[PDB]
Amino acid sequence: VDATLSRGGTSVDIPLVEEGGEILLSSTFGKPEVNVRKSGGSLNPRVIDSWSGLQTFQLVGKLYDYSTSHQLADLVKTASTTPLELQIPQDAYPDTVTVAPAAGQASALTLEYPAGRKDLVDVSLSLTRVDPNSVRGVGDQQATTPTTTGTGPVEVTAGGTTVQLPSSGLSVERTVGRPNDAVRRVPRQADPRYEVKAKVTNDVFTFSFETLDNIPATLNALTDNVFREQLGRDGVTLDFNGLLGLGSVKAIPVGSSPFRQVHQAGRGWVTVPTLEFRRIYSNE
């Protein structure tokens, strides 16, 4: 029923549960390092297989409290040379595999907190199988999610002005990954080497909502203070005020399309499909 993901003392059980005929587990096997010749005077190429293969695990599940969700995010984001162990509840797998968060990806863990659902979180994990004895590194960096026991609106503070995000149709997605870790080929064995790096991680919060009332004032406050100002080295304070048990993080909107205002025919309100924030330097 539950897959256990653990690192020493820290343990999270993810219920491998989903509706109907949805994919709970995908295990992809590969040989990224086979050299197949592009040319030569044969009909069929000569090949050489000399290196570790690839095994990628994709886990889809559901978590029944926010506390465990934050623990999972912290577990995935942490830089530590203590092996990360995955226990899969299926007989086609060994009892424990040693894993890295997806080898080069910004999105190893996705957590979705959708509208209408209470105490039910969507989990998507991507993990890469690494050699248990080849987890190498120097630094420990303990990831923490700031938590508080409030109830207040999601607040966005930039340049002395606070915007309160509409509760109406409000969804949150959190993406976590470790793209700066190196998973590397080794000769003569099945599984690659994991170089744990005490370096920059990916941590992104995405919001979706409908703006229903005081529409100009709400949207203009966000766009004027966040988008039309230069923020400098500092950024935006994103405060959950205890929603989902979350607190305050420093963030910035990144890229070409982090915010969209959508107007549909015959509607008296504005849709925000996406508002994206990446967590910036804070952690002493």
Partner: peptide, 23 residues
């Protein structure tokens, strides 16, 4: 994957990438 005169200029970094979280 890029080539000058048929020789690959891409580095054989033995570095893995694997599929992202589905969403």
């Amino acid at each position: 994957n890029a080539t000058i005169d048929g020789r690959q200029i891409s580095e054989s970094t033995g570095r893995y990438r694997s599929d992202p979280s589905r969403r």
